[model samples]
Target: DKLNILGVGIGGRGSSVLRGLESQNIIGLCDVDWKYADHVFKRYPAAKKYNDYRKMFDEMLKSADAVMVATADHTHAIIAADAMTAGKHVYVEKPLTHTVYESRLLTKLADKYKVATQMGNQGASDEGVRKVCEWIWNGEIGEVRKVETFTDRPIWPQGLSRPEDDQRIPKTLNWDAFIGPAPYRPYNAIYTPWNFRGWWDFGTGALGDMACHILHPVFKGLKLGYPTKVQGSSTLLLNESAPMAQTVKFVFPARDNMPKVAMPEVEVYWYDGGLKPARPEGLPAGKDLNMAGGGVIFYGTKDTLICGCYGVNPYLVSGRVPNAPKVLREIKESHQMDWVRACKEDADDRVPSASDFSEAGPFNEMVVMGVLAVRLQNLNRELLWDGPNMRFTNIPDDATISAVIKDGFHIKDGHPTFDKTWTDPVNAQQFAQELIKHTYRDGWKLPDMPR
Candidate 1:
């Protein structure tokens, strides 16, 4: 049976993702920018189109079985929750949510609504990622400790002040809907089509943009959960956007579920925006050090394993790709189809998608925490995280924090400074807490977490 799908934000990356789901019935198309989404509209001629998702839902909710959201990161949570609340299965794009809190909410909502969910970390469905998991679980890497994930991203602007000029809104775009739940800002060409990923209000920066794809293997292969500590060092810390380059560290304690060997605490390092790890000790001279699509390096007690982004072409730094017996079933379908398969009730062939929210939610929480770490790096303190409670265990004192903020804030406009961000500890914490969970604009509402 063909599934009825609604494609949201069906332009740019959404158009490519739609191609994977094109095998199914595309019943609806929703987007704010019709000009940008015009080609997709022509491709799916039978689909009904609308700029606002709420109107599409009001008119045609019952006609669709699932919704695929490829909107801006900040709007992902609200749009996805709306689809889930309508009793529709949802496939959301990478990073899951703009804030850490929204990740937890979506994870619970899926269970309560009994809906299928998958995140668009396409690597989650790739053969390379599965091999990365199998080799480590087979103990071929032997007691893995540190994993470094890097990417050449932020091909968009960063570490800059918001352009002061607000251009006339393009007639094709529904600017108000594009603003969605984020605080209202005037229209600017710098934010639309592609570059939104660099802004604080619109996208999740380079780490948020690529980490979900780049770090999917680390989270899966290592059986990682919450990080006990997260900290960062960046070229420059900005208040409104991310630096061109930043390095963040997440420390995870050993998990009891290790299969073949004793797993020790793992330190995960994330580098982006032209930063990369040094080549492994024994890697041949011919192997390229370029991480254009991003890559991963796992240093284990026995030997190191390296792979390109999405876990493609993994090779042991010491030589010889071990032929470990497969521990996981191969995914033959595209990542989009994997979710399509899960949406059906036919248990005969039902298998969960690789990066279902059950898996993606927790993985995303860790990634969002890394985002928070980078944002708060100006504090110059190791952020001790309590995952279950969702708060930083250790925070600096008022005077010390004020001094650090004054020194580290090279750019004035974008620092996390609220009224008392530099003066009072309690106020600074409240501001940081706001970043974890932003207050929604009047009309936008996120569904409450399931009981």
Candidate 2:
């Protein structure tokens, strides 16, 4: 028999995860909006339902062996951590949490609890990702030092002023639960369902949404760790949403036992909002670099390997190699199924999930740092990263960078202020602490763990 599972936030992407687990015993389901979730609610008729996950856990924790978290970006850490605290295995959506500290905390919790954990970056399990790694290991692309990735995201709105209209709360929606862990705000359609991703309070913007997918192979193939330095540039940012466009660069140091590469440190470039890297000189005369919606180019000493979204269709810029393998996997299960099978294995026999917390926790930290760099663009100087301490070393002492460090963005009239507040701090150690963790609301505080 399959393990009994409880699903939190079973709508939209959550619904897709639920459908993929058709063989499992879905014992309970939870979502904030009844109207939007009615379809999934009916789909799992025998499953108990609740608007708040905490209530579901209170009543049904004992019946579940695992929990799947499909909530928004901000609530991910809270829900997943609580489930693990209850000794339940967990699967969570990508860009694991709203902040870097939260991701690290979740990783620690999973380790302490010894629960099977997976982050919902399905691309990590794709055959293409393995091929990318294999090719690099085989020296098909010799010693990669620089990578360029681009995405055409924000199909939703971004870089705009917040809506002024205070709309009536939908009766079918549990407004308070939807805003759980996030700062309270009046009801508005502008922030619900999908638009929240572009906002700083509830989402991590484009980097949060796409990096988990676009950066999967780069993180895996290169065996990346905490970046040593990060910087970002973007069009004018608004107090409410992410920038209309942005470019972030990360510098990663070489790892122990890493295959021979071109440089000791790798430089990675991320482009969004129709922006792309300069076309490679070897990409052939007539081919266009913008042909793919989003892709990555590994500039290696021997050859250039390029692939599209989710690390699909990797090939030499010169064209496909004569005997290149199109797909490379012995196991052909869905990403969700991979986690399910791991949960079913004996503790000693279980293999780590493809995007387990051990791997994904660090992956998410890099993504979150990129988001921070976007907000700190006005700081003028690159924010030096001290990964082990989880802090920035050179924060400007004055209120300018301090406020951005404290608030994660410019402030205006008590809302996110759009104007840039530039600064160069003299005492930087204190400023680093603020960027390390989030200040949780009183009732929703994360369980304290030693730093």
Candidate 3:
């Protein structure tokens, strides 16, 4: 039987997710940008159309069996959270959430509701990731204590001053809905149709955009938990948007769950926007690490292992990859259908989807921790993070987080003004608690995590 799928953000990337599940019954389609979603609406003509997801649920909640969210980083939490509250299984795009707190809440919601959940880091279902994990377990590269992951992201613009002009809202779009849960702001052409990722209020920038996908092999293969410390440096650390380029280092503690290999303290570094670590020591003279797209170099005691951004094309610096018996189960169906397959199962015997929230939620917490570290880099301290406690353990009670005075960036007379130098209120974090959660707007709150 086909699952009744209702899709939000059914324009742009959401359109791709819908196509993956087009084999199933797409019951409803919703997009704030109506014209942007015209093609999808035409494709799924039998499905209902909605400008607002809330209205989509109000009109067709019971008829839907699952909901898929491929929206901007900011709205992923709210849309998916609502679907879970109504007992709808959910598949959200990668990073899983905008804030660390939202990922935690969604984790709890999926557990409590007992709904099948999958985050959209498709590499989790691929053979490449499986082989990486298997080889690590088989000790092909020996003890891997360090990993260098890099990406060529922010193809969209970033590190820009916030837009000040009030562009008239298009008749085909719902501007208020697009704004979602951050601070209230007027519309501009720069904020939407995929560019929102460069902004702080609405997007997770390059780090949030690419980290979840690029780091999957490390987290899964190494059994990495929350990082004990996170620190980052970037191009400018802008007031309202992400930097043009950045490097973040995370120190993860060792674990006791190793099956065939020993687990040890690991340090992972993330580089993006054309930055990369030095080439592996024993590489072919003419070969280029950049020859492949994005790379993850796992520095092991015996040998170095390098793989593509999504765990594809793994090989030792010696250009050999010894095979090992598969220890991990592979998903026969596509990642989207894996979730649909789980949606059809009884909870008692449901096949767990790869990148399920129990894993994705925690994976996302570490990924977005880089987002926090980058945003608060202005404070100039290694962020002593207590991941389990979700707080910074070391903050002087008397020290105040700084509000970076920036060029033409500040609020005046209860309105965002950007024409003159003004001090933004408490722009940087000394305590580190502020960035963990979001301040949702009126009537757009996440449902409480069920008891």
Candidate 4:
């Protein structure tokens, strides 16, 4: 069976990612800039190109079978949701959604449409992560209690109060479409490919970049759920609240086979730049902490398992087994391409992949909460949460712990006015699905897999 494909956001990282998709027809391509469309045409002369993705999708969607969304963090939820609703299988880049609300929406929409979905983590499909999970299940770590994870990228300039005035939007960029549901603001170069990781609006910081990789083994090993309480303490930067270098604390109530009474507490930390992660004795000492930029150290009550950089061969150690444990089967590959193959076979799946969501959601939630916890670090002098009621016990004031809805964006009261123009499509139901699909801006829609 022939496969027609659509690609959203062709510039920067997206273009590099599309290089791997060259075998496909690559029919439709969408990006904020004409340069992107022109670039794709140069590489794949057969493909058509466009600037406005919505119009492209409206016109060319029926011809495409699958969609690839490699836009920034902010656009992931919208483009992916729209594609799934359009009945196209989706492959999206990681840090799946920009916000926690969007994450929930993606999970819900994938189920509703029954489309094959894969978060573009790329490396999760490797047999090593799976083998590591198997090791844990076999009591390899003897009940994981605490985890330490970190990233080394510091491109996101911290210590800045905020952007200065008269910041001009790039001539090649569609600023309005770029801002989308996020609060409108003047464009800044730092917020794009390099700097957005630190901003509250553009990206979810280091946690967003590394959590999927760092949390994979733990989430899969334990089958954890949403955490009950979350808090943070960070080295003061320009914005003490916006954690530049921080340690976040999350408490997840035990569930499923995890014994509530016997289970020990878990902790995940995010760091960058000069800061280095604490290494366990299981790993060689005084040497480099990570060959790859980021990894996880799972501390169990009785032993330690250290894995980093796409869950590499984890080192397992205990008193009973003084030296590291024996070998197991190893599968070396990425989780993303596996899903693409799966989609080609027409297997039913969900957003962020099947095993991926099961394996990554708790990790996703944990890391995002760490971001949120740091974002609101200053609301109350001391932050304490009541797990049962989902409220902060120490804050006392309602607004401190409650979500503050900005006016015109607030959906409440008897004022149920139906407006076609979406104000908050990422969080709104009506336009969210419409806003979420990959635009095929340059005429790359979902491709028909060889069936």
TM-score of each: 0.92, 0.90, 0.93, 0.77
Best-fitting candidate, scored by lDDT: 3
Off by over 4 Å in 2: 259-263, 286-292, 320-329, 402-435
Q: How do the candidates rank by lDDT, highest first?
A: 3, 1, 2, 4
Better of 2 and 3 by TM-score: 3
Q: lDDT at 69 for candidate 4?
A: 82
TM-score of model 3 vs. true structure: 0.93
Better of 1 and 2 by TM-score: 1
Better of 2 and 4 by lDDT: 2
lDDT of 1 by residue, 1-451 (tens): 7989898888988999989988899999999999988999999999999999899988888899999999989889998999999999899988799988899899888877778899998988888888888888888989888888898887866876667775898889998998899999878878888788888787888877888888888888888888898998887565666678989999999888565866779999988888878777888887875443888999988999888877787888887688888888798888888899899954344467888788899999988887788777767788898877778867644423221122232435666633312333334576678778998888988877767
Candidate 4 on 1-451: residue-level lDDT in tens? 5457788877766776677666566898877766434666567666677666677779889999888887777767767767777888777777887655556556666566666677766556665577666666666566766677666654456644455666776677776666655656677665664456676666766777766766666666666666666776566532211345776666666655532223445554555545766667766555455647766777777677767767776766443432324443343334444555556664433234444343443345456666656645655443454432333455433332222122133445855653322122122222222222223333333322111
Q: Model 3: runs farther than 4 Å from truth?
A: 402-422, 425-431
The sequence of per-residue lDDT tens digits that candidate 3 reaches over residues 1-451 is: 7999999998888888899999999989889998878988999999988988888899999898999888888899999999998999999998799889889999999899899999999888988889998998888878878999988887777767767676799999898888888787878878888888888878888877777878899998998878898888888666677878999999998887466677888999988888888777887777666533577999998878888877887888876768798889888999898988888899989878998898999999988889888766766678788877687765555555443334556788889975644344452443356678776788789988555
lDDT of 4: 0.60
lDDT of 4 at 59: 88
The residue pairs found clashing in candidate 3 are: 403-427
Candidate 3 structure lDDT:
0.84
